[PDB]
């Protein structure tokens, strides 16, 4: 499942969505275009570790480049493939 983050996204809100998906599907992908959206995305993933720790879960991430579209042009974006790992 994919979650898109922009420069105005709120880290905590996105983190909650990452957490919910990690608890259900066990994985999720986060995509962002540009420095600010990427920054907000990293913060969100970092915060998401705090939401799932209580559920005995942590996560690992793998970044990659991916071509997406921003108002119909093609743009190079960064995506984070996130996987949940059990702590016990
Ligand atoms: Zn692990």
mmCIF file of C-alpha atoms and ligand atoms in Angstrom:
data_model
loop_
_atom_site.group_PDB
_atom_site.id
_atom_site.type_symbol
_atom_site.label_atom_id
_atom_site.label_comp_id
_atom_site.label_asym_id
_atom_site.label_seq_id
_atom_site.Cartn_x
_atom_site.Cartn_y
_atom_site.Cartn_z
ATOM 1 C CA UNK A 1 0.000 0.000 0.000
ATOM 2 C CA UNK A 2 1.434 3.453 -0.668
ATOM 3 C CA UNK A 3 1.379 6.648 1.378
ATOM 4 C CA UNK A 4 2.375 9.913 -0.278
ATOM 5 C CA UNK A 5 3.999 12.676 1.775
ATOM 6 C CA UNK A 6 4.312 16.345 0.807
ATOM 7 C CA UNK A 7 6.273 19.267 2.266
ATOM 8 C CA UNK A 8 3.165 20.213 4.281
ATOM 9 C CA UNK A 9 2.314 16.749 5.632
ATOM 10 C CA UNK A 10 2.299 16.473 9.421
ATOM 11 C CA UNK A 11 4.895 13.888 10.591
ATOM 12 C CA UNK A 12 2.730 12.618 13.464
ATOM 13 C CA UNK A 13 -0.332 12.123 11.270
ATOM 14 C CA UNK A 14 1.668 10.228 8.613
ATOM 15 C CA UNK A 15 3.372 8.194 11.363
ATOM 16 C CA UNK A 16 -0.043 7.072 12.602
ATOM 17 C CA UNK A 17 -0.974 5.906 9.112
ATOM 18 C CA UNK A 18 2.367 4.097 8.718
ATOM 19 C CA UNK A 19 1.789 2.431 12.083
ATOM 20 C CA UNK A 20 -1.766 1.333 11.254
ATOM 21 C CA UNK A 21 -0.620 -0.210 7.961
ATOM 22 C CA UNK A 22 2.369 -1.881 9.650
ATOM 23 C CA UNK A 23 0.065 -3.497 12.216
ATOM 24 C CA UNK A 24 -2.281 -4.807 9.535
ATOM 25 C CA UNK A 25 -0.311 -5.521 6.342
ATOM 26 C CA UNK A 26 3.097 -5.722 7.994
ATOM 27 C CA UNK A 27 4.559 -3.355 5.399
ATOM 28 C CA UNK A 28 3.973 -0.123 3.554
ATOM 29 C CA UNK A 29 5.710 2.150 1.095
ATOM 30 C CA UNK A 30 6.167 5.902 1.587
ATOM 31 C CA UNK A 31 6.931 8.166 -1.373
ATOM 32 C CA UNK A 32 8.084 11.775 -1.404
ATOM 33 C CA UNK A 33 9.220 14.290 -4.015
ATOM 34 C CA UNK A 34 11.661 17.023 -3.069
ATOM 35 C CA UNK A 35 13.771 17.833 0.055
ATOM 36 C CA UNK A 36 10.934 19.002 2.312
ATOM 37 C CA UNK A 37 8.588 16.117 1.500
ATOM 38 C CA UNK A 38 11.500 13.698 1.981
ATOM 39 C CA UNK A 39 12.353 15.365 5.300
ATOM 40 C CA UNK A 40 8.765 15.150 6.531
ATOM 41 C CA UNK A 41 8.710 11.499 5.434
ATOM 42 C CA UNK A 42 11.846 10.532 7.377
ATOM 43 C CA UNK A 43 10.484 12.214 10.532
ATOM 44 C CA UNK A 44 7.229 10.336 10.132
ATOM 45 C CA UNK A 45 8.970 6.957 9.854
ATOM 46 C CA UNK A 46 11.076 7.795 12.901
ATOM 47 C CA UNK A 47 7.949 8.748 14.841
ATOM 48 C CA UNK A 48 6.145 5.607 13.649
ATOM 49 C CA UNK A 49 8.686 3.503 15.578
ATOM 50 C CA UNK A 50 7.237 5.025 18.749
ATOM 51 C CA UNK A 51 3.668 4.098 17.808
ATOM 52 C CA UNK A 52 4.449 0.432 17.151
ATOM 53 C CA UNK A 53 7.044 -0.252 19.896
ATOM 54 C CA UNK A 54 4.131 -0.771 22.335
ATOM 55 C CA UNK A 55 2.844 -3.519 19.991
ATOM 56 C CA UNK A 56 6.215 -5.228 20.121
ATOM 57 C CA UNK A 57 7.201 -4.136 16.647
ATOM 58 C CA UNK A 58 9.964 -2.122 15.125
ATOM 59 C CA UNK A 59 10.665 -1.472 11.460
ATOM 60 C CA UNK A 60 13.393 -1.395 8.871
ATOM 61 C CA UNK A 61 13.483 0.797 5.805
ATOM 62 C CA UNK A 62 15.087 0.608 2.363
ATOM 63 C CA UNK A 63 15.177 3.770 0.218
ATOM 64 C CA UNK A 64 15.119 3.727 -3.593
ATOM 65 C CA UNK A 65 14.561 6.135 -6.479
ATOM 66 C CA UNK A 66 11.276 5.890 -8.308
ATOM 67 C CA UNK A 67 9.675 7.809 -11.147
ATOM 68 C CA UNK A 68 6.352 9.375 -10.192
ATOM 69 C CA UNK A 69 4.250 12.216 -11.543
ATOM 70 C CA UNK A 70 3.803 15.733 -10.204
ATOM 71 C CA UNK A 71 1.024 17.587 -12.126
ATOM 72 C CA UNK A 72 1.541 15.274 -15.109
ATOM 73 C CA UNK A 73 5.274 15.707 -15.565
ATOM 74 C CA UNK A 74 7.441 12.710 -14.561
ATOM 75 C CA UNK A 75 9.626 13.406 -11.510
ATOM 76 C CA UNK A 76 12.330 11.433 -9.725
ATOM 77 C CA UNK A 77 11.047 10.660 -6.206
ATOM 78 C CA UNK A 78 12.308 8.775 -3.170
ATOM 79 C CA UNK A 79 10.407 5.839 -1.823
ATOM 80 C CA UNK A 80 10.832 4.003 1.441
ATOM 81 C CA UNK A 81 9.932 0.336 1.517
ATOM 82 C CA UNK A 82 9.056 -0.275 5.148
ATOM 83 C CA UNK A 83 8.905 -3.698 6.779
ATOM 84 C CA UNK A 84 7.734 -4.557 10.291
ATOM 85 C CA UNK A 85 9.923 -6.813 12.449
ATOM 86 C CA UNK A 86 8.812 -8.468 15.717
ATOM 87 C CA UNK A 87 10.663 -7.582 18.938
ATOM 88 C CA UNK A 88 9.641 -10.809 20.663
HETATM 89 ZN ZN1 LIG B 1 14.621 -6.150 12.921
#
